[PDB]
Design a binder for these strands. Structure first.
Lengths: 68, 68
DNA sequence: ACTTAACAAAAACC
DNA sequence: TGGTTTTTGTTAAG
DNA sequence: ACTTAACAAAAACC
DNA sequence: TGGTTTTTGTTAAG
């Protein structure tokens, strides 16, 4: 069978890191090939656009206030 | 030749969306296959772990205060 | 610190 | 007991 | 609103 | 003028 997966957000940073391991690589590969290795700006923008795609403008604005 | 790319963070949300278009798909595909289609939690965690990997704990804490 | 991979063991499933 | 996968932490390396 | 793809045109490069 | 790619916005569809 295998142990059931807990929600990503409930996991330790260690276990969270283990689950995204493969996507972290794909993101790295993309950022390198297309955005001059700027993972932060890429993940920041993915997250921002993911928020605004969901109409969470208030949260997106607050994150945009934090990042400057 | 082709027009030089501006920095991702200087672009309009429209143009930003156009550049990440392909990574947005890979992220979608991953979230669906591995995280029950939870793009937000995935991008949130990628960004958080990207911040803490860079020792930007203060910013990561503030984003973690915003998201609850 | 952070990262990484390896070695472990416990946990939760069959 | 056996299996598995997930979760954690430690351990040994950058 | 958001999304998407299409159609446009201007911009910045050759 | 031609080419290209990028940037924007609009347009027509969910």
């Amino acid at each position: 069978g295998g142990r059931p997966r807990q929600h990503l957000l409930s996991l330790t940073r260690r276990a969270q890191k283990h689950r995204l391991r493969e996507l972290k690589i794909q993101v790295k590969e993309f950022a390198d090939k297309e955005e001059g290795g700027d993972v932060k700006a890429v993940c920041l923008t993915l997250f921002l656009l993911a928020l605004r795609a969901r109409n969470e403008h208030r949260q997106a604005d607050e994150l945009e206030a934090i990042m400057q």
